[PDB]
Amino acid sequence: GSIINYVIENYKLKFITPGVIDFICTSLIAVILTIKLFLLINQFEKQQIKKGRD
Amino acid sequence: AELFTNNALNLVIIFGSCAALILMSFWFRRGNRKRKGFLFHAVQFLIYTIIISAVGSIINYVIENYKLKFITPGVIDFICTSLIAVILTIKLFLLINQFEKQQIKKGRDITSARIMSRIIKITIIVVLVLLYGEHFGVQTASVIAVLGAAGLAVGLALQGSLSNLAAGVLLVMFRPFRAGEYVDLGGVAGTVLSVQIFSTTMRTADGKIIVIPNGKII
Amino acid sequence: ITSARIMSRIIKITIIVVLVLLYGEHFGVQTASVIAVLGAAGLAVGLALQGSLSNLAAGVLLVMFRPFRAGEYVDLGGVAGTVLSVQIFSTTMRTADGKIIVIPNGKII
Ligand SMILES: CCCCCCCCCCCC
Ligand SMILES: CCCCCCCCCCCC
Ligand SMILES: CCCCCCCCCCCC
Ligand SMILES: CCCCCCCCCCCC
Ligand SMILES: CCCCCCCCCCCC
Ligand SMILES: CCCCCCCCCCCC
């Protein structure tokens, strides 16, 4: 993502602004954090139900 | 001339943002396959704000371009963020009012639901000033200290209810007793009818209902 | 008149205190020692108002969750009687003897 950021530092011709890319790059990874982190909690709940908990 | 070379990306989202609203807006008109809730409303507000940011700031850049117009950059930025804040209040008040209507329908008393709505209105307004304390009006060190003192006072007042909530969570997780089990919770004995968030209801052998806060039980 | 006069004075004092907060820097001066002393005063006031805030929260809870309603015989910790009304800070019950008892909501909760 920052490789493309540097690619842009290079070809400034593209109207693409550095700020948006940095905002998107870190924003995208955050989303994966939620989706990835929610799965484990849901998986943990499934095991808890299996163990015998109400 | 030499300014459209930077607006191209901005116009891309503007057109996409404008089309995004139509797709989601017409979906609500055409029934509701997914749960309505407040998630869709937040997206609507979240998509609407981008248009203001995209095109409000699009016009901001338009001005960075034609400085001829006496229009000053500061006012536009103040108006752009100020306008979106107003939509936040109008949009956010509707859901709370809608929630109150459902509560009345469910069976809750008018005063029971009316009091609940007022509590949300006061808390929502307090949060709104926090998010726009600097932009709107002013926020000084004395103001911050007084607001922190008020928050501390509120937190100290709500100590009992939070303690009861924590005790109820613990009683739900660890089960020293269950609904239908004779128990003696500190001088009171009776069949347990139900464990709730703040208190549990037991029916003594005599036949009377007793409600005990969860914190005292724990 | 004294009931309303006292209420007006309380608003005057609080409104003035807020006015200096909003113009402490522009008008006069606002130093770090001044900020610390004002924060200490606010903390003292908040600690003093702990009981009233607790009663308010308890009353809100009693209004939301209804362990009892106006006209229901109850026993709120050693006192029993028909419940006449639940208010913000306290509720009024009338014992079977015929006397009125007022109990703070926090103690009830
Ligand atoms: C440079 C920013 C200074 C902010 C000062 C905040 C002071 C908060 C005092 C809180 C007292 C309870
Ligand atoms: C009706 C009362 C609503 C709650 C008001 C709380 C005020 C706290 C002031 C603390 C000052 C340090
Ligand atoms: C000073 C404000 C403190 C507010 C604390 C709120 C805690 C809410 C816990 C969840 C309740 C269901
Ligand atoms: C309002 C606070 C709710 C959470 C209370 C603490 C629960 C901790 C459980 C720990 C189990 C190992
Ligand atoms: C640069 C701003 C410094 C502000 C310092 C505030 C100190 C507050 C102390 C509060 C003690 C209770
Ligand atoms: C002065 C404080 C008023 C609010 C008291 C807390 C009410 C929490 C209700 C939570 C219901 C789930």
Residue numbers in the entry:
A (entry chain C): 58 to 111
B (entry chain B): 3 to 220
C (entry chain A): 112 to 220
Task: Quote the study's own text.
To prevent cell lysis, bacteria have mechanosensitive channels that are gated in response to the elevated membrane tension and release solutes, restoring the turgor within the cells. One of the medium-sized paralogues is called YnaI, with 5 TM helices. Structural studies have shown that the main difference between YnaI and MscS are extended sensor paddles, which create a periplasmic indentation in YnaI, and much smaller portals in the vestibule that provide the cytoplasmic access to the pore. The TM paddles are in contact with the surrounding membrane and are therefore responsible for sensing the membrane tension, while the vestibule with the pore formed by the TM3 helices conveys conductivity and selectivity.
To further investigate this hypothesis, we explored a chimeric construct comprising the sensing module of YnaI and the conductivity module of MscS. As the splitting point, we defined Gly139 of YnaI, or Gly90 of MscS, respectively. The structure of the chimera purified under condition I+ and analysed by cryo-EM represents a closed state that shows the MscS-derived conductivity module unchanged. The YnaI sensor paddles of the chimera have still the same structure as observed for WT-YnaI but are slightly shifted and tilted as a rigid body compared to it. As a result, the innermost paddle helix TM2 aligns with that of WT-MscS. The helical backbones of the pore helices are highly similar in the chimera, YnaI, and MscS. Noteworthy, the densities in the pockets of the closed and open chimera maps are only poorly resolved. As the pocket architecture entailing lipid coordination involves the paddle helices and the helices TM3a and TM3b, the pockets in the chimera are built by helices of both donor channels. The chimera showed that two modules derived from different channels resulted in a functional phenotype, with the gating threshold inherited from the sensor paddle donor, YnaI. The conductance is significantly higher than that of YnaI and similar to the pore donor, MscS.
